[PDB]
UniProtKB/Swiss-Prot annotation, chain A:
This is Deoxycytidine kinase. Its main location: nucleus. It is found in: Nucleus. Phosphorylates the deoxyribonucleosides deoxycytidine, deoxyguanosine and deoxyadenosine. Has broad substrate specificity, and does not display selectivity based on the chirality of the substrate. It is also an essential enzyme for the phosphorylation of numerous nucleoside analogs widely employed as antiviral and chemotherapeutic agents. Changing S56A: 4.5-fold increase in Km.
């Protein structure tokens, strides 16, 4: 593809969806692939073409909730689904959007890399996946990204950096029910993984190009109106260096 | 261009044995074995974990099993046989038996809950909407043995992980195989399968006694594909 692929990375409730879905309106050649969180909170699979004419598509379970309620049981399942749903969404947007754009940019809300190296890894490190689950997950992730990764390789990353405290407040502002018991400690562990990966750049992955991918770091701790102008000026300048 | 034939049958019916014999008939015939060794040494033993605690481990096992299968079947297409007269690949089972026999039975036995089963089917539909095409079968060989025969063969083979399997589990798997490949009443969401030809072979007898003739019957079935 000629479509530039930029991932927006950041902790839970940092403000990624808010920022990028406002940002994308500046340019008709800019689209977003949102994170499939609704597919996690209401688990559904495809209906048969005849059955769907007389049967409704039922609300399923909430595997995001299941993970938060018992992570030692449900982390592997959630992480596997999260990543699959994401790859599906990302690949379809590449094949189908911005075909007639002049300078097309697709912004991803998170990546397969944060799925593995931030979230799944932290769960493994906190004994919510055992060695077998962690091996199986990394095998699957490796294999998929050897088939598919080329098409999904990133041209750049925009790291939206917020303190764990800001994130915890923003989880309360947003009101997602299954997130209201998340403790500061968990956000803080995610925070440090993001810093290692994107700020200090010491976190090593199995995808060598990532050590070189350009990264733009933006502080999003202030109220939205207070820095938006400067954020946008930084983003445009960043994009033109790619 | 490669003809793809799955060998299907219950646990210890004699699939690996059969396919290993079949292979030797032609340099242009290869086999994709089920990645069982990988399952038993991930090392953790995920086969054992599923058998000992199936409500805890059945989803994990079914997705790894199917993943491992897809990876091996895909791999074998890319290498060996692209450069043969009539290339044939024999798959030890398929993504269809993984889902519609084994996983489905575990769901019916309440070893996967609704969420796990939905996630599994979504994963399976997507994983095959991408690949599947390259792995579509030209034919199926069903090795039919009774549950009692399969229980005996499990003991002969002596895999530790399997020695606790009750006859009743084998009966459930047998009913699903018969429904899929004999009665043809098992509904899947892959429309092309309804038309794949199936050769059913009774392997209940000691292989000292009817086996070489079963083989010929394959050699010849393959000529109709
Ligand atoms: N800069 C900001 N100032 C005030 N509120 C913000 C800011 N950015 C995000 N929010 C609010 O914080 C919450 C989480 O934002 P959201 O974009 O959903 O985070 P993410 O996509 O990173 O998980 C929402 O309630 C949103 O209104
Ligand atoms: N027809 C047969 N007669 C006697 N033993 C058989 C026969 N087929 C297979 N066996 C033996 O039964 C066991 C199971 O066979 P195997 O090929 O591993 O089964 P599968 O691949 O179907 O699980 C092995 O110990 C094998 O040597
Ligand atoms: N690989 C991921 C991705 C997201 N999330 C969670 C964090 C939020 O609660 C929700 C939406 O980002 O999903 C997660 O646990 N693991
Ligand atoms: N989808 C699958 C495939 C295989 N097996 C099991 C049956 C045997 O015990 C072993 C080798 O076939 O793996 C399984 O439970 N589920």
């Amino acid at each position: 593809t000629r479509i530039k692929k930029i991932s927006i990375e950041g902790n839970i409730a940092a403000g990624k969806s808010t920022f990028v879905n406002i940002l994308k309106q500046l340019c008709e050649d800019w689209e977003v692939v949102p994170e499939p969180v609704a597919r996690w909170c209401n688990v559904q699979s495809t209906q048969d073409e005849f059955e769907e004419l007389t049967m409704s598509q039922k609300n399923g379970g909430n595997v995001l909730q299941m993970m938060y309620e018992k992570p030692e049981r449900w982390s592997f399942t959630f992480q596997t689904y999260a990543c699959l749903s994401r790859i599906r969404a990302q690949l379809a947007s590449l094949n189908g959007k911005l075909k007639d754009a002049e300078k097309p940019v697709l912004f991803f809300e998170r990546s397969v890399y944060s799925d593995r190296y931030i979230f799944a890894s932290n769960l493994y490190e906190s004994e919510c996946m055992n060695e077998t689950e962690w091996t199986i997950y990394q095998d699957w992730h490796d294999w998929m990204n050897n088939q598919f990764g080329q098409s999904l390789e990133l041209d750049g990353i925009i790291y939206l950096q917020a303190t764990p405290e800001t994130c915890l407040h923003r989880i309360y502002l947003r009101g997602r029910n299954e997130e209201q018991g998340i403790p500061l400690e968990y956000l803080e562990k995610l925070h440090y993984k993001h810093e290692s990966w994107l700020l200090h750049r010491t976190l090593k992955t199995n995808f060598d190009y990532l050590q070189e991918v350009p990264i733009l770091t933006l502080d999003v701790n202030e109220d939205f109106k207070d820095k938006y102008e400067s954020l946008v000026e930084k983003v445009k300048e960043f994009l033109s260096t790619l």
